[PDB]
Design a protein around this ligand. Structure first.
Ligand SMILES: Cn1cc(-n2cnc3c(NCc4nc5cc(Cl)c(Cl)cc5[nH]4)nc(N4CCOCC4)nc32)cn1
Lengths: 320, 239
């Protein structure tokens, strides 16, 4: 019950790979003893690269400190192969165990058999920002928010998962952090310009890409490299310039990474089909200047989310 | 999980069962804790990261023997893992370089031909032994929290803290971290520092006549428990 790591992974019956996570693939398994459905993340031990990943240690430390409705709950940790009776030879791995969720947001948007109403988006965005605000209040950055990391059950309950790139941030002091975080399609502009002293505003940007994707059913920034990714962000949110972002000259890659033109902001006209209450939220979440970008607590106070009573939530039906 | 044993259990550790007399194991625990404290200090590591590795060290040899695992190799692995836990990570090559500077070449021989591999390998069974319970609290945060509520002579209170702070450093060499919670150890080092300084700690509290001043910080802690902890700390200076 309390002796984690002792239990062997052969006590689980791996069914199949269900997706690609932070540090490896995600497996779907059934406990051979409890019959419960779980998800497994395999952590590797490089032994020639500081051993057990600190990113895995961060996710273990953080997920054993969080208890919330919209967050994933790590169940236990099991070991791969029993040690050859000289432990100096055992070179296996460990498996983080999680609760299994019925749906992921990536597969729902890709199918086309599902269509989310306005109340469905108001419910999903409410739970996502309530979970992100609780982590920011606890001084934890997700640093990797995408559609495959957002899970959904049949009861309409949203949970945020895959904290493989999470870490603690200093709330009352600036600190240098890791730059190469967040997937390219959801990475904020400041990270594309090489900012290492960023704020929790990087996760709000990714959630801003989720909100716009919930209406278009397609990622809004799809590029194959860092320069082309900054190009697509500039053509919609405007080019990063000191007028919209005075602190942009302090960034290392400001003069290195430059779009073809100095595009204006065409966000409000491109998403005109979006309801007015959601467009005001989308415009504020996709602000170039992270200091002028809204926080997680501010999103819950916006007109699109302040009056969204989560209870009596009606989820869409895509059945057998 | 429960990480606290009795004194009767501390006399029957895996090392005791394999023939090692209690005098030498207590010495290896002191040498191991002194090693982690000296290596991390030279690396400029935060005081919580030092105590975390030492707690990993004491907790390790409650399930494994000193005869199978060298103390300085395990002590190195504890400090390496502790840095990644407390977000103060140090390269393993930097810990080995600091270890070979302090340890004799005979003592450093425990790492074998490949000192880096010997520590990375031990990390697998170290995590299993600690049961992946990485978050560990130390008496420092409670020593500061309790003493900050004390109103009185700013000099006498400051001398009380810097003296109890030294006592917590000395308590890491003993199995006190395996007997009583950090809140209790934090109260105990205050009780000891108040005796040698001839300070009446109860006069700096809301109840100046109530002799058991610590009941506002911890609940249901008799005086004999504090006396037991003070006795084990005073045994370090009698040697
Ligand atoms: C890190 N972490 C993850 C979880 N977690 C729990 N539940 C699921 C889950 N359940 C719906 C689901 N989606 C599926 C897609 C396929 Cl193709 C198949 Cl065959 C079966 C599927 N089932 N999906 C996923 N992934 C979605 C894809 O990208 C990676 C994450 N992660 C999950 C817990 N912690």
């Amino acid at each position: 019950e309390s002796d984690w790591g002792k239990r062997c992974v052969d006590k689980f019956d791996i069914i199949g790979i269900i997706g690609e996570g932070t540090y490896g693939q995600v497996y779907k398994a059934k406990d051979k003893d409890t019959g419960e459905l779980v998800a497994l993340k395999k952590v590797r031990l490089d032994n020639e690269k500081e051993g057990f990943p600190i990113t895995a240690i961060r996710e273990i430390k953080i997920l054993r400190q969080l208890i919330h409705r919209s967050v994933v709950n790590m169940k236990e940790i099991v070991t791969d192969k029993q040690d050859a009776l000289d432990f100096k030879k055992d070179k296996g791995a460990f498996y983080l165990v999680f609760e299994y969720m019925d749906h992921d947001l990536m597969g729902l948007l890709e199918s086309g058999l599902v269509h989310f109403s306005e109340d469905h988006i108001k419910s999903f965005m409410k739970q996502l920002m309530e979970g992100l605000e609780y982590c920011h209040k606890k001084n934890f950055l997700h640093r990797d928010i995408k559609c495959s990391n957002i899970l959904l059950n049949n009861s309409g309950q949203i949970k945020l998962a895959d904290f493989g790139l999470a870490r603690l941030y200093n709330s009352e002091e600036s600190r240098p952090y890791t730059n190469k975080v967040i997937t390219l399609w959801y990475r904020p502009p400041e990270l594309l310009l090489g900012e290492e002293r960023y704020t929790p505003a990087i996760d709000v940007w990714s959630c801003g890409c989720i909100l716009g994707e919930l209406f278009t059913k397609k990622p809004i920034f799809q590029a194959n490299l860092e320069l082309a990714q900054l190009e697509l962000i500039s053509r919609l949110c405007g080019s990063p310039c000191p007028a919209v972002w005075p602190d942009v000259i302090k960034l290392p890659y400001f003069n290195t990474m430059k779009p073809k033109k100095q595009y204006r902001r065409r966000l409000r006209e491109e998403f005109s089909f979006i309801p007015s209450a959601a467009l005001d939220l989308l415009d504020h979440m996709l602000t170039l200047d992270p200091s002028k970008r809204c926080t997680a607590e501010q999103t819950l106070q916006s007109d699109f989310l302040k009056d969204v009573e989560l209870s009596k939530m009606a989820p869409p039906d895509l059945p057998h | 999980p429960c990480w606290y044993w009795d004194k009767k259990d501390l006399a029957h550790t895996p090392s005791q069962l394999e023939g090692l007399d209690p005098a030498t194991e207590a010495r290896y625990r002191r040498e191991g804790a002194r090693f982690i404290f000296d290596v991390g200090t030279r690396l400029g590591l935060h005081y919580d990261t030092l105590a975390t590795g030492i707690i990993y060290f004491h907790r390790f040899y409650m399930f494994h023997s000193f005869k199978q695992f060298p103390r300085y190799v395990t002590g190195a692995c504890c400090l390496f893992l502790a840095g990644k836990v407390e977000e103060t990570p140090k390269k393993c090559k930097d810990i080995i370089k600091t270890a070979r500077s302090l340890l004799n070449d005979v003592q450093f021989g425990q790492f074998g031909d490949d000192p880096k591999e010997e520590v990375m390998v031990l990390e697998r069974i170290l995590l299993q032994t600690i049961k992946f319970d990485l978050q560990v609290e130390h008496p420092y945060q409670f020593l500061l929290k309790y003493a900050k509520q004390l109103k009185g002579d700013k000099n006498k209170i400051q001398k009380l803290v810097q003296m109890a702070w030294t006592f917590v450093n000395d308590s890491l060499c003993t199995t006190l971290s395996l007997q009583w919670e950090p809140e209790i150890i934090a109260v105990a080092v205050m009780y000891l520092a108040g005796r040698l300084c001839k300070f009446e700690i109860q006069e700096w509290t809301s109840k100046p006549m109530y002799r058991r001043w610590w009941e506002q910080f911890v609940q249901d802690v008799p005086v004999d428990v504090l006396e037991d902890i003070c006795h084990q700390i005073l045994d370090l200076y009698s040697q």
